Amino acid sequence: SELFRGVLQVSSNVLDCANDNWWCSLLDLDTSDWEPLTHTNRLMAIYLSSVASKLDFTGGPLAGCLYFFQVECNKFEEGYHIHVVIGGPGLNPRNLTVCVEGLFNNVLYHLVTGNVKLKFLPGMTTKGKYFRDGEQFIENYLMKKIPLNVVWCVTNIDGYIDTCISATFRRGAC
Secondary structure, eight states: OOOOEEEEEOOOHHHHBEEEEETTTOOOOOOSSOOOOHHHHHHHHHHHHHHHHHHHHHOOTEEEEEEEEEEOOOOOOSSEEEEEEEEEEEEOOHHHHHHHHHHHHHHHHHTTTSSOOOOOOBBBBBTSBBBBOOOHHHHGGGGOOTTTTTEEEEEEGGTTTTTEEEEEEEEHHH
16 A cells, blocks of 8 residues: 555643543543553543544545554653554645644544644655655554553554554564
């Protein structure tokens, strides 16, 4: 496949501006092969789930796209960062950033107080082109993370729908 990849940063300002809608959102999350999700970790898992649900039924440039979203927090990291792997017939290097930002920010809009938005940074090659190695990046890198270093993961890609939130499979992949 030829999937793009990039990252959205989540500063601590985003979580500081989380509103009642976000803190009170009730959504089922399958943590039976995961660590318990509480506090702002659960908010990020809920958010990622909501973004995926929106994407599953969106038209326009994002129609029919394959995606893999993974929210992470490293040691000493404030906030979170979201790895995005995404591709489809309507997505191209000219519209990728606006389309991904619009998708994530349209969901975030109802969850934060104020004009708080995320930005998307595409991963770029040595020659300055957008990477199209997204599926290999999932296999080589993203799937080798274990919770709660990886906080949550959502995908519609065949090879990962059954392992994306399997701590057991992820542990064996490292």
